Amino acid sequence: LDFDTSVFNKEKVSLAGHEEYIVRGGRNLFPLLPEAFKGIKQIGVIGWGSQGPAQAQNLRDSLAEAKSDIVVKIGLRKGSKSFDEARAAGFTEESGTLGDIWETVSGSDLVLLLISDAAQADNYEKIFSHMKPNSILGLSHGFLLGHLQSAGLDFPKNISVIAVCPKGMGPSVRRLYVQGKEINGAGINSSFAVHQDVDGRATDVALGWSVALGSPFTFATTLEQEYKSDIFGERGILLGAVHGIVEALFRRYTEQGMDEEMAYKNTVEGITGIISKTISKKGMLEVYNSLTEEGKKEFNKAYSASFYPCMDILYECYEDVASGSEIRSVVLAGRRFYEKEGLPAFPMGNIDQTRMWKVGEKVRSTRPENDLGPLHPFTAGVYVALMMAQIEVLRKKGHSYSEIINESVIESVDSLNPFMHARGVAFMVDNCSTTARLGSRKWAPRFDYILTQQAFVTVDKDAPINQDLISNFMSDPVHGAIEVCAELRPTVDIS
Amino acid sequence: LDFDTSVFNKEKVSLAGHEEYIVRGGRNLFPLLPEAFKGIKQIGVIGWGSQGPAQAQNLRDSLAEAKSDIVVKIGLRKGSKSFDEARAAGFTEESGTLGDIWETVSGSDLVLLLISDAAQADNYEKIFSHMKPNSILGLSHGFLLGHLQSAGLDFPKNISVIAVCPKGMGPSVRRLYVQGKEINGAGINSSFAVHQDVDGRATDVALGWSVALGSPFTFATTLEQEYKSDIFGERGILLGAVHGIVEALFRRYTEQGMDEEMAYKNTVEGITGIISKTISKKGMLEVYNSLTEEGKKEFNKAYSASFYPCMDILYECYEDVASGSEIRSVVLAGRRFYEKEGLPAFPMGNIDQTRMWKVGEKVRSTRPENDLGPLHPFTAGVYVALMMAQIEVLRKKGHSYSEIINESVIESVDSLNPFMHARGVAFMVDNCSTTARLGSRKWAPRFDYILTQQAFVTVDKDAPINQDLISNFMSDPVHGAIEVCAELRP
Ligand SMILES: [Mg+2]
Ligand SMILES: [Mg+2]
Ligand SMILES: [Mg+2]
Ligand SMILES: [Mg+2]
Ligand SMILES: [Mg+2]
Numbered sequence: 001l002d003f004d005t006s007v008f009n010k011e012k013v014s015l016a017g018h019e020e021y022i023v024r025g026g027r028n029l030f031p032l033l034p035e036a037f038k039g040i041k042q043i044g045v046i047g048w049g050s051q052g053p054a055q056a057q058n059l060r061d062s063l064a065e066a067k068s069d070i071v072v073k074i075g076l077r078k079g080s081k082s083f084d085e086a087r088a089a090g091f092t093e094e095s096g097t098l099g100d101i102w103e104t105v106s107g108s109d110l111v112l113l114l115i116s117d118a119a120q121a122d123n124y125e126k127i128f129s130h131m132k133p134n135s136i137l138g139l140s141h142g143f144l145l146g147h148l149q150s151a152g153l154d155f156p157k158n159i160s161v162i163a164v165c166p167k168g169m170g171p172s173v174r175r176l177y178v179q180g181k182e183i184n185g186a187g188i189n190s191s192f193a194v195h196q197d198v199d200g201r202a203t204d205v206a207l208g209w210s211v212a213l214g215s216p217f218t219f220a221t222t223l224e225q226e227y228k229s230d231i232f233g234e235r236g237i238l239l240g241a242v243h244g245i246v247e248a249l250f251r252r253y254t255e256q257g258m259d260e261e262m263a264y265k266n267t268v269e270g271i272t273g274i275i276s277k278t279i280s281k282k283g284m285l286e287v288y289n290s291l292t293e294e295g296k297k298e299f300n301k302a303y304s305a306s307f308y309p310c311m312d313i314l315y316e317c318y319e320d321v322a323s324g325s326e327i328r329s330v331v332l333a334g335r336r337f338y339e340k341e342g343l344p345a346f347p348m349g350n351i352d353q354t355r356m357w358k359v360g361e362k363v364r365s366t367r368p369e370n371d372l373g374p375l376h377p378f379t380a381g382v383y384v385a386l387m388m389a390q391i392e393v394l395r396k397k398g399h400s401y402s403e404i405i406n407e408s409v410i411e412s413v414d415s416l417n418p419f420m421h422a423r424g425v426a427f428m429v430d431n432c433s434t435t436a437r438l439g440s441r442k443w444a445p446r447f448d449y450i451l452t453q454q455a456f457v458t459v460d461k462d463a464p465i466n467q468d469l470i471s472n473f474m475s476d477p478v479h480g481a482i483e484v485c486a487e488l489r490p491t492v493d494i495s
Numbered sequence: 496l497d498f499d500t501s502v503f504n505k506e507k508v509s510l511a512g513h514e515e516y517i518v519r520g521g522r523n524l525f526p527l528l529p530e531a532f533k534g535i536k537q538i539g540v541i542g543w544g545s546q547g548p549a550q551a552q553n554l555r556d557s558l559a560e561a562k563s564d565i566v567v568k569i570g571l572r573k574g575s576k577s578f579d580e581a582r583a584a585g586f587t588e589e590s591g592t593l594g595d596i597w598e599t600v601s602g603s604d605l606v607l608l609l610i611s612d613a614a615q616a617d618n619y620e621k622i623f624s625h626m627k628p629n630s631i632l633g634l635s636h637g638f639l640l641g642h643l644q645s646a647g648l649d650f651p652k653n654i655s656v657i658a659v660c661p662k663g664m665g666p667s668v669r670r671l672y673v674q675g676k677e678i679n680g681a682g683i684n685s686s687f688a689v690h691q692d693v694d695g696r697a698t699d700v701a702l703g704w705s706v707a708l709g710s711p712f713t714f715a716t717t718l719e720q721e722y723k724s725d726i727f728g729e730r731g732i733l734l735g736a737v738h739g740i741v742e743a744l745f746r747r748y749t750e751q752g753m754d755e756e757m758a759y760k761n762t763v764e765g766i767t768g769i770i771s772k773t774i775s776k777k778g779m780l781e782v783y784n785s786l787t788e789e790g791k792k793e794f795n796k797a798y799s800a801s802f803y804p805c806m807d808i809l810y811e812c813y814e815d816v817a818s819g820s821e822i823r824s825v826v827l828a829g830r831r832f833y834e835k836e837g838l839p840a841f842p843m844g845n846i847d848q849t850r851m852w853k854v855g856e857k858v859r860s861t862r863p864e865n866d867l868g869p870l871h872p873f874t875a876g877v878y879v880a881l882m883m884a885q886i887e888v889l890r891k892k893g894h895s896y897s898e899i900i901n902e903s904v905i906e907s908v909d910s911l912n913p914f915m916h917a918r919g920v921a922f923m924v925d926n927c928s929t930t931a932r933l934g935s936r937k938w939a940p941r942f943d944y945i946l947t948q949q950a951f952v953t954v955d956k957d958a959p960i961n962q963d964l965i966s967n968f969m970s971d972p973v974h975g976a977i978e979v980c981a982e983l984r985p
Pocket of ligand 2 (some may be wrong): 229407
């Protein structure tokens with residue numbers, strides 16, 4: 001995958017023998033932003049929420065640093081409860097930096113559409129109708145492309161469509177940007193895509209946006225690949241699959257006689273604490289190598305039994321995401337949150353009141369400072385098998401190593417898992433983005449059932465270790481690639 | 496829903512104040528078949544699973560009784576078990592009543608496509624290309640319509656498309672047909688649909704087909720409604736939801752200290768036995784009214800807590816079936832049974848090796864002849880909530896009372912659940928046809944989790960009973976409608 005930039009310097013990286021191009025970020029590049037943003041007088045940031053404030057504040061600061069006259073203007077829907085917050089952050093009608101969504105879109109040369117997936121599905125025609133011909137629509141996630149594709153539609157021919165997709169939560173996008181004013185390499189990495197380029201400006205505008213957000217590295221992808229990776233990934237190891245496997249394991253361990261609190265520690269605590277830390281620092285091989293000789297056998301039993309069951313569900317989920325089925329189901333699900341067709345409304349409920357999450361509350365409330373939990377070898381084998389199976393599905397489905405590793409390993413162990421170690425998995429299932437929450441609710445049960453029906457049955461039958469799986473794990477090229485990619489991480493902790 | 500038949504008389508049924516037309520059959524109507532089948536010289540029966548053998552022999556017998564010269568010809572791949580069986584039943588190349596699939600299609604005025612969902616999805620272009628213009632394609636289930644719609648396609652404009660959908664298993668369609676030669680009104684009821692009628696013959700042909708199958712009554716539906724009811728229904732109460740709720744309840748009861756065998760009895764045995772039998776004989780109200788005063792309170796706690804959670808998943812599933820999402824996922828899943836794209840093969844696995852199914856094997860190995868099991872009021876409340884929630888989704892989504900009742904209540908307690916009581920739920924899931932098996936695996940976990948995460952949490956809160964839900968249940972017009980429909984059973 002190549003791209004052509006007139007403004008920035010393309011650097012090469014090699015992962016498992018596969019070369020990719022990246023664009024290194026840094027404040028020393030800010031003087032290039034006026035050139036990157038030629039033809040741009042106003043950037044309209046549409047929506048507040050999580051990414052809106054972070055991106056608007058970062059862009060504002062970067063453009064000021066660059067001595068650019070470009071105006072960053074927040075556009076909000078009439079029902080928004082975020083006007084006062086926007087004004088408190090210096091985005092105001094008086095200064096020309098806050099307005100109604102439609103007015104704001106109309107005046108913008110680059111429209112950053114940062115409203116919810118559901119709001120995008122409901123509003124795209126009107127958004128398109130308000131945009132200047134030859135202007136640029138920027139997305140920070142590819143949901144809308146997937147939605148249009150599912151309906152046999154595409155974007156209008158008269159606008160460019162680009163994406164800059166940060167590998168971190170909004171608050172971290174802002175936090176690390178401010179830190180980056182002092183610490184070289186502090187910022188949240190992003191990937192970028194150019195879906196349509198109507199006038200030749202799109203690539204430099206995308207890279208300019210990423211650099212101005214403070215991305216220490218910007219990786220190259222396509223909008224189709226980004227949405228498939230993201231929507232599948234959250235149903236996989238990022239959220240859905242981790243919830244499902246921990247329910248399955250907690251049930252198993254307690255069935256075997258383990259005390260509930262210990263069962264929680266050996267499942268949830270271990271995955272989101274010590275296992276995540278170990279993978280973040282030295283990778284998956286170190287998880288196995290850190291075990292006792294006894295523990296290695298247990299790890300291998302779990303991995304050998306769990307790899308294919310996890311792959312079965314991941315493979316199914318990926319194809320449903322790619323085919324249109326899953327995005328269509330998400331769009332319809334959102335519509336069922338309200339009364340229609342004479343039927344009741346069904347907003348999402350909470351998970352946090354079942355057996356293991358009640359136990360988790362107790363565990364965390366008595367948990368010592370900086371406790372990372374026990375490393376249970378069986379739990380480790382299942383979790384690592386899940387990670388390796390997701391990597392393999394994405395590999396065979398044509399994704400780049402940087403995207404596989406950045407979104408399915410690094411962002412998991414460095415961004416999401418630490419968040420989940422602090423608040424519990426239930427918190428995330430109850431409080432994440434709607435599309436991710438729906439995904440977790442739909443697919444967590446699939447992982448629980450397949451582990452329980454197949455993986456655990458294999459272990460309980462005393463099945464022989466599948467040495468093909470184990471040797472493949474130990475020799476997999478991804479481990480070296482993870483080491484290389486892990487060096488491109490931000491220079492401060494991201495969550 | 497009206498239809499216009501020149502050959503058969505229709506009569507009305509009134510269900511919850513909604514009138515529908517039905518067509519009463521009987522062997523006494525067989526002299527009407529020649530006119531019903533005007534323009535038909537050969538009926539080609541394509542395929543030989545569970546339905547082919549029954550439909551071929553029933554049509555052959557009915558046409559013989561009618562003194563008709565219409566030829567019933569089986570289209571099958573020479574060199575197979577099915578081919579052997581057809582020859583043993585008297586369909587032969589020598590007599591021109593057995594031949595190659597494509598030659599049979601090409602020579603048929605009515606083509607009955609009885610091959611699997613997967614086979615229809617893989618072969619429809621070739622079937623269509625071999626059909627005579629103005630001939631008639633008959634389906635016994637609407638999967639192929641759902642498949643075509645998912646791809647934004649429809650049938651060719653030069654053929655009629657009809658469906659006749661028996662409410663029973665293939666063996667019963669034949670066995671009861673044979674019984675019906677001696678015992679009046681023995682046979683399996685059907686629904687019919689006319690999706691396309693290119694020359695005005697489609698309705699009489701559909702009804703002739705249904706009557707000639709020995710259907711004591713034929714109900715009216717649409718092909719789209721039939722495939723939605725079927726594909727959603729198997730993910731719901733017919734299979735997937737029963738598996739899910741029983742996993743959830745077994746887990747709950749054992750957590751509460753109930754011994755495992757009793758937990759199995761109070762969930763699976765009760766549902767497929769005494770609860771099913773009670774509903775079959777006297778309906779859902781009788782289930783509630785049979786309970787002790789204490790049991791009634793437990794039923795109501797369970798119903799109040801479970802109705803909406805069940806509805807939530809049923810509503811989701813229904814919309815995925817109707818939108819194209821689910822049928823596409825089924826087609827894709829089939830292709831993952833084999834290696835492709837450098838990825839492994841993933842054939843369907845079994846459910847029967849987990850905790851509750853091992854317990855069930857042990858319980859069943861000792862269960863006496865005709866034990867219907869205990870009627871646990873909490874289980875009854877959950878199961879009845881699920882049934883009422885499915886009824887409500889179907890009703891709001893536009894289905895007729897007869898289709899709701901025949902397919903989601905009657906066929907379930909009278910055909911499917913007795914089969915599951917005999918063979919076990921795990922057996923039914925693990926050996927079911929592919930679309931239903933995939934459905935069960937995908938959706939059972941959803942019902943398990945929604946009950947566990949929501950319904951049971953509500954109960955454990957000591958949430959006050961939702962009196963409107965309970966009142967709505969007791970007064971629901973579906974109960975009277977079931978009584979009326981139940982009387983049209985074979
Ligand atoms: Mg492209
Ligand atoms: Mg993402
Ligand atoms: Mg997402
Ligand atoms: Mg059916
Ligand atoms: Mg079916």
